[PDB]
Amino acid sequence: MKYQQLENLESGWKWKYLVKKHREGELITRYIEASAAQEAVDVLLSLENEPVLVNGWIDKHMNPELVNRMKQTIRARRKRHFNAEHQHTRKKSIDLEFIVWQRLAGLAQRRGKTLSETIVQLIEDAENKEKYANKMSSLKQDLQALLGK
Amino acid sequence: MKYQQLENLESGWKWKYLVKKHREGELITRYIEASAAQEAVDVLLSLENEPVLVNGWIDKHMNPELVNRMKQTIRARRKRHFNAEHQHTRKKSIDLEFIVWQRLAGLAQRRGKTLSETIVQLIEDAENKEKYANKMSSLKQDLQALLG
Amino acid sequence: MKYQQLENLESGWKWKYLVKKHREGELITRYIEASAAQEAVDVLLSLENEPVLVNGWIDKHMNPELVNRMKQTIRARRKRHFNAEHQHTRKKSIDLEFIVWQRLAGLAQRRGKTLSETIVQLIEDAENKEKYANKMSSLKQDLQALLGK
Amino acid sequence: MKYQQLENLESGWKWKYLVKKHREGELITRYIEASAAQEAVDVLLSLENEPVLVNGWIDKHMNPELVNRMKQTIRARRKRHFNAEHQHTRKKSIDLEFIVWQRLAGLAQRRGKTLSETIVQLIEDAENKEKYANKMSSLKQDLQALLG
DNA sequence: TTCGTGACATTGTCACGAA
DNA sequence: TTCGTGACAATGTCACGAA
């Protein structure tokens, strides 16, 4: 755990979680009835401006099989923040032709390495071609003259 | 255009659109007062089963701040469909590191070509360097052998 | 022929011929009996200083059987003389061991060319040893500084 | 001394010599006189076959101008004899041109080798060159097998 | 001094190719 | 046949170097 915790906002974060889903429709509560669950819908809706008070509610009305989906989504956004505190870590997304990907990826999984470097190497292996064209050609074209003189 | 329209469903999306955005907080409505605008929410949040009418709702009810944002976001949800059919047309998202991007994009910036052209051109040439190190490796292997 | 003839002088050495050979122990006359044969001898030595005389003498008197041996021994001196003049013209001999003679003499009957010339080449190519003794030592170094890069 | 000096023939040998130079025109007597010469001539010429005779014939009766001339010419014939046997020790002479002799004799007299040997050592080198140009044809050729 | 030895000069045939 | 020509043969010397 290289990224510290922030009880304050890190809690309000989870709050947004039980919202972004409840909106599109997804059993937030750990109950089955649409009577006991519906009730809980408001039991939290009011905790808007309510910090750590949010945690009090997890042990109360929080669907178990969600604890997984959440942790995974939390840590994620958790890293993005700290990583956004500068540039080198700030990641960016890219869209390219399918077939292209297939190669790349297939080259990442086959070239015992991760995408990143795999892209870093595929580059160095390119700019080197220029001086490798002649480097191999010179040692070959300069000797062609030995056949006679 | 390269793709044709589907009035029946096409408009369908927009619906799915105005709702969505609304669900998150937005005045899809062309009005303001918590009344008239309020009605136009339910008045539209119903054409679900008969979306072939949403269009006539957008032409004289939807907030104009979204006319463009839509024609775009839709025209996209359109291409995104037809390509999602086959495989060669499909697409894929990647998440590479900052540093890389610079150099990477940078190259694509100096050549101008597609950001994908970069992976082709880099694989195509950077792979031809993996070639001369082979013709220069099998050569230094049969050159010195005969010699000593 | 090629050279010239010395009517007077050449009869000179020509004379010494039957002479130096007669005292050696051989028949110069064509008379089996020691009466006419011995007569010719005495009559011969008297010509100690006569040219043309020796000519007619050889005719009626000398043994026309060794003639050939003479025409050969005489022709030689014709040549050994005009040649012995200038240096590059004078011929000279040497004693070589059999072993060595073999190869050499045997390279003449194969290559065809004269014995002398034979040595002329044997030498040139030989002396040229360094010329190609270096081409290798040299040409071969050009490949070493390459294979190791 | 390596050659067993067999007084038997070697003596008779001298004879032919004293006889030869005689038939040519040279004194074979220590006599300061003409006539006195007719003595040795026939006196010795009759020794057609005299061992110990012709021998002492010298210490007591023979020209002095030939004392060394003989001791040496004799050694020659002597060596020629034991040598006449096997061809691997006997010899032959050559008639070569002057100019050739020069270069030849030169290197020979120079390198500090015997005339005969000179040729031998010179032949080896005369072949190496003819051999070195060969390895050139193999290497020069094995370069285009692959290269051009 | 004697001797083994290498370098030539001499001088003589011998079998040949082009007058 | 006639010759210039080349390959060796044979035999004597000479100046050296080790005995």
Added chain:
DNA sequence: TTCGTGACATTGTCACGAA
């Protein structure tokens, strides 16, 4: 089990070169 993290999926945007 809790993390960090990398591989990707959806879906919204907007300048752009023709059409």
Added chain:
DNA sequence: TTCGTGACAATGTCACGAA
């Protein structure tokens, strides 16, 4: 205008190997 389109932003999971 209207399309097709490409570079990224936001962010929600999932199955990994070290803690």
